[PDB]
């Protein structure tokens, strides 16, 4: 399974079958045949495999990286600190990439699960997607193929100079 809060789904509301005609639809018979012929043998095989998993239980872990000093508190041309800052920045870069991927999955799943009323009923996912793409674009865009924490800090300083100049000229 997964976590229902990071991958949200609204509650499924299926309608009850209200057959009007007297003709028996083939789909109920095919659902019964799929449950009797397919779902039960696959379920038995999976329960056997699950018992064989339960006979020897072992674990893997999620690797925790502690927060080393970033590039702003590294001395210039001091490789033993700015190496660690650069590795921290590259890991956070991959994590921010996957956050953008998660929100894209949310947007596409909303569009499919809402179907035809998706333009009204997916305004929240579109707003979250616009926010996270604007943040990712202000954070990591236009750095180049030799991207680094120095390049990203220089882009941030240029953008903050633009923000401070726009604050000064409009006051």
């Amino acid at each position: 399974s997964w976590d229902k809060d990071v991958y949200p789904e609204p509650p499924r509301r299926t309608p009850a079958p209200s057959p009007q005609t007297s003709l028996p639809n083939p789909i109920t018979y095919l659902t019964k045949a799929f449950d009797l012929l397919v779902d039960r043998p696959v379920t038995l095989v999976r329960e056997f495999i699950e018992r064989q998993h339960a006979k020897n239980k072992y674990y893997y872990y999620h690797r925790e990286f502690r927060r080393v000093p970033d590039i702003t508190e590294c001395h210039e041309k001091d490789v033993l600190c700015m190496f660690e800052a650069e590795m921290q920045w590259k890991r956070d870069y991959k994590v921010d990439q996957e956050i953008v991927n998660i929100i894209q999955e949310r947007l596409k799943a909303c569009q499919q699960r809402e179907g035809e009323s998706h333009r009204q009923n997916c305004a929240k996912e579109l707003q979250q997607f616009t926010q996270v793409v604007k943040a990712y674009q202000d954070r990591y865009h236009d750095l180049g193929a030799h991207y680094s924490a120095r390049k990203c800090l220089a882009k941030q300083k240029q953008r903050m100079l633009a923000e401070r100049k726009a604050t000064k000229e409009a006051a």
Binding site: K77, V79, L80, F83, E84, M87
Partner: protein
């Protein structure tokens, strides 16, 4: 190899190579200053020994 092993090995490599790079820049600056000033142990081109000089009383006194 573990990521710990590669990580700390990379830090050892970066220490050694940054120390070599700073020593190469110091070596270039030391060579420049010693060639310019001539006060170091390098670029000591030979001059005449003063042990070759004879300080005996010569034939004529005005010397």
């Amino acid at each position: 190899d573990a990521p710990e092993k590669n990580y700390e090995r990379t830090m050892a490599i970066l220490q050694i190579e940054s120390e070599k790079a700073e020593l190469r820049l110091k070596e270039l600056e030391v060579r420049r200053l010693m060639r310019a000033k001539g006060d170091g142990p390098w670029f000591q081109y030979p001059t005449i020994d003063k042990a070759l000089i004879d300080h005996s009383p010569k034939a004529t006194p005005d010397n």
